[PDB]
Design a protein around this ligand. Structure first.
Ligand SMILES: Cn1c(=O)[nH]c2ncc(-c3cccc(C(N)=O)c3)cc21
Length: 194
């Protein structure tokens, strides 16, 4: 199978582009499983609910990081690994790069602490390809965040893509839809090969 993750803020056309990619693969007779993080299983979605619900009690940054990984551990065992084992293409909306971006960049948690959790929870599993939807910068907890938080998120994704170029493709989400999809179209041949 192939593990593809999609990263980027809301409003960047990630969902419609994920559907587009799913259709181009399914039309070629490839099995595709769509999923998202945090979430993807009943327990993981209950965890997503705690992470998104605003509350008068502030959530510690360490709590936010640990809940993101707890949901990841469940989703990996329940959905992602089984899907990859069937030979499916998994198209996952957000994954550990979001942890580096939101919790590392956004919240200030050390990169090494995130890396240690990534290694614990995932073993050697990493996405085969990560599509970064780059976009210049009742509300849920992340929606409530300010411009600075989101600029840190944006730049973190870009830094990560630059560190491991072989695994990422940065798309300019500010461009028209048709333009972004043509980029996906051009990306398809390598995918069908990978
Ligand atoms: C998967 N993942 C992670 O590891 N750390 C994360 N932080 C935030 C989101 C997230 C989820 C829904 C919406 C938004 C948002 N509105 O920006 C962010 C997703 C994350």
């Amino acid at each position: 199978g192939l593990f593809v993750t999609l990263e980027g803020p809301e409003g960047a056309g990630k969902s419609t582009n994920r559907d587009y990619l799913a259709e181009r693969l399914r039309e070629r007779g490839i099995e595709v499983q769509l999923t998202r993080e945090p979430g993807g299983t009943p327990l993981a979605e209950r965890i997503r609910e705690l992470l998104l619900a605003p509350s008068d009690e502030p959530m510690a940054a360490d709590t936010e990081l640990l809940l993101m990984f707890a949901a990841r551990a469940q989703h990996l065992a329940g959905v992602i690994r089984p899907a990859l084992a069937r030979g499916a293409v998994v198209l996952c909306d957000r994954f550990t790069d979001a942890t580096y971006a939101y919790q590392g960049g956004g919240r200030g948690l050390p990169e090494a602490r995130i890396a240690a959790l990534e290694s614990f929870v995932q073993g050697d599993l990493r996405p085969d390809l990560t599509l970064v939807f780059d976009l210049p910068v009742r509300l849920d907890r992340f929606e409530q965040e300010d411009r600075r938080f989101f600029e840190a998120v944006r730049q973190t994704y870009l830094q990560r893509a630059a560190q491991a170029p072989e695994r990422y493709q940065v798309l300019d989400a500010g461009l028209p839809l048709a333009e972004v999809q043509a980029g996906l179209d051009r990306l398809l041949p390598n995918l069908l090969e990978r």
